[PDB]
Design an enzyme around this catalytic site. Structure first.
Site, mmCIF file in Angstrom:
data_model
loop_
_atom_site.group_PDB
_atom_site.id
_atom_site.type_symbol
_atom_site.label_atom_id
_atom_site.label_comp_id
_atom_site.label_asym_id
_atom_site.label_seq_id
_atom_site.Cartn_x
_atom_site.Cartn_y
_atom_site.Cartn_z
ATOM 1 N N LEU A 10 -8.510 -12.726 -5.361
ATOM 2 C CA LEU A 10 -9.088 -11.475 -5.848
ATOM 3 C C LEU A 10 -8.029 -10.609 -6.519
ATOM 4 O O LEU A 10 -8.316 -9.898 -7.481
ATOM 5 C CB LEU A 10 -9.732 -10.701 -4.696
ATOM 6 C CG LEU A 10 -10.920 -11.360 -3.992
ATOM 7 C CD1 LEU A 10 -11.350 -10.513 -2.795
ATOM 8 C CD2 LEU A 10 -12.068 -11.522 -4.973
ATOM 9 N N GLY A 11 -6.807 -10.670 -6.005
ATOM 10 C CA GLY A 11 -5.729 -9.887 -6.582
ATOM 11 C C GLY A 11 -4.575 -9.685 -5.622
ATOM 12 O O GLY A 11 -4.536 -10.285 -4.548
ATOM 13 N N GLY A 16 1.296 -8.689 -0.216
ATOM 14 C CA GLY A 16 0.535 -9.909 0.006
ATOM 15 C C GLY A 16 -0.620 -10.032 -0.957
ATOM 16 O O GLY A 16 -1.044 -9.048 -1.556
ATOM 17 N N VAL A 18 -4.639 -11.168 -1.980
ATOM 18 C CA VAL A 18 -5.960 -11.076 -1.364
ATOM 19 C C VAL A 18 -6.872 -12.159 -1.927
ATOM 20 O O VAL A 18 -7.012 -12.295 -3.143
ATOM 21 C CB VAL A 18 -6.594 -9.694 -1.594
ATOM 22 C CG1 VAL A 18 -7.971 -9.639 -0.935
ATOM 23 C CG2 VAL A 18 -5.678 -8.613 -1.028
ATOM 24 N N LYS A 33 -6.196 -10.671 3.131
ATOM 25 C CA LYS A 33 -4.920 -10.260 2.578
ATOM 26 C C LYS A 33 -3.892 -11.130 3.291
ATOM 27 O O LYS A 33 -3.809 -11.113 4.519
ATOM 28 C CB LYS A 33 -4.667 -8.786 2.893
ATOM 29 C CG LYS A 33 -3.378 -8.211 2.313
ATOM 30 C CD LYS A 33 -3.376 -6.701 2.484
ATOM 31 C CE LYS A 33 -2.238 -6.038 1.739
ATOM 32 N NZ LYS A 33 -2.487 -4.588 1.540
ATOM 33 N N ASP A 128 -1.859 6.710 -2.460
ATOM 34 C CA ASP A 128 -2.044 5.700 -3.487
ATOM 35 C C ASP A 128 -3.466 5.666 -4.037
ATOM 36 O O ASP A 128 -4.003 4.596 -4.328
ATOM 37 C CB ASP A 128 -1.639 4.320 -2.961
ATOM 38 C CG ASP A 128 -1.374 3.331 -4.083
ATOM 39 O OD1 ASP A 128 -0.815 3.749 -5.126
ATOM 40 O OD2 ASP A 128 -1.710 2.140 -3.921
ATOM 41 N N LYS A 130 -6.107 5.585 -6.606
ATOM 42 C CA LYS A 130 -6.213 5.210 -8.007
ATOM 43 C C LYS A 130 -7.468 4.354 -8.183
ATOM 44 O O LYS A 130 -7.981 3.802 -7.209
ATOM 45 C CB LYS A 130 -4.958 4.442 -8.439
ATOM 46 C CG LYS A 130 -4.685 3.190 -7.641
ATOM 47 C CD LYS A 130 -3.342 2.578 -8.027
ATOM 48 C CE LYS A 130 -3.114 1.277 -7.287
ATOM 49 N NZ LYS A 130 -1.768 0.727 -7.541
ATOM 50 N N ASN A 133 -7.899 1.013 -6.591
ATOM 51 C CA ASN A 133 -8.153 0.956 -5.159
ATOM 52 C C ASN A 133 -9.532 1.396 -4.702
ATOM 53 O O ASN A 133 -9.760 1.556 -3.505
ATOM 54 C CB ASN A 133 -7.078 1.742 -4.401
ATOM 55 C CG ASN A 133 -5.727 1.062 -4.455
ATOM 56 O OD1 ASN A 133 -5.647 -0.141 -4.697
ATOM 57 N ND2 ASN A 133 -4.663 1.816 -4.218
#
Length: 282
Positions: A10-11, A16, A18, A33, A128, A130, A133
């Site tokens: 997923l990204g 780590g 995911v 993750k 964080d 954004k 997220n």
């Protein structure tokens, strides 16, 4: 980990990678993750991993924060098994849609507000916030994800001082080197809201240095088609002095832009859209 099938990546989040993972025996899918203990030690972010685990455990309590089901380890990696949200992230949607209409952006903004306020009420500064997220669940509601950069025990007049965050979203008080609190999340929120409505970041720069200068001095551009109460909310969020910023001062929920929202019903979702890591398992 062999009990899961790793269908795709997923990204990459805070730390780590995911993966979309299926628990073989049930066909149930999850978002896992994965972290390599070895780079976690070199990058000495052992506590950063505990932070995320902690906030994810806390998040179970709130509907707009990503939940974690369990955690487990292999002899070389750390794994967070979280709920899978098939709607994708907002950054992706804004890229393909260019921008969101005011009603849609307002709805997401409101749920993001509750998610942030919950975190703040629990002594946590997210740091964080954004578009990348913010994920969408299958019901159309959003969920904040990736808590690796949170600061806990931020209670009362507590302030912290680590320079951090994604450049486009970094608050001016951090750039000016002041000790800070939850106020930085309200600035990032403003940037995020501006992006959902305009499809562009409010502060620009060919590089980070120019971007920082822009965040410190410039006034964002507001298109003639931007509704007045939305412009007004953004202007109150982009106040440099943190103690005079809406969210820090006043009641952001009472802003005219959110006049049609019943916050309690919203939260109830009644408004349609060597031994370093021991006992880590859970």
């Amino acid at each position: 980990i062999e009990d899961f099938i790793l269908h795709k990546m997923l990204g990459k989040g805070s730390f780590g990678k995911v993966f979309l993972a299926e628990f073989k025996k049930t066909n149930q899918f999850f978002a896992i993750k994965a972290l390599k203990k070895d780079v976690v030690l070199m990058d000495d972010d052992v506590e950063c991993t505990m932070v995320e685990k902690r906030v994810l455990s806390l998040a179970w309590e709130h509907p707009f924060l990503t939940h974690m089901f369990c955690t487990f380890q292999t002899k070389e990696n750390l794994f967070f098994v979280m709920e899978y949200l098939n709607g994708g992230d907002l950054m992706y949607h804004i890229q393909s849609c260019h921008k969101f209409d005011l009603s849609r952006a307002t709805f997401y903004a409101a749920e993001i507000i509750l998610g942030l306020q919950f975190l703040h009420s629990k002594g946590i500064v997210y740091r964080d916030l954004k578009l990348d997220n913010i994920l969408l669940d299958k019901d159309g509601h959003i969920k904040i994800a990736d808590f690796g950069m949170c600061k806990e025990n931020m209670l009362g007049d507590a302030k912290t001082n680590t320079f951090c965050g994604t450049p486009d979203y970094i608050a001016p008080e951090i750039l000016l080197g002041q000790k800070y609190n939850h106020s930085v999340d309200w600035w990032s929120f403003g940037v995020l809201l501006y992006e959902m409505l305009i499809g562009q970041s409010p502060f620009h720069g060919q590089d980070e240095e120019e971007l920082f200068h822009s965040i410190r001095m410039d006034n964002p551009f507001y298109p003639r088609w931007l509704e007045k109460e939305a412009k007004d909310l953004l202007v109150k969020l982009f106040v440099r002095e943190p103690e005079k910023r809406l969210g820090v001062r006043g009641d952001i929920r009472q802003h005219p832009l959110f006049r049609e929202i019943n916050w309690e019903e919203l939260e109830r979702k009644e408004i349609d859209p060597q031994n370093m890591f021991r006992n880590f398992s859970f």
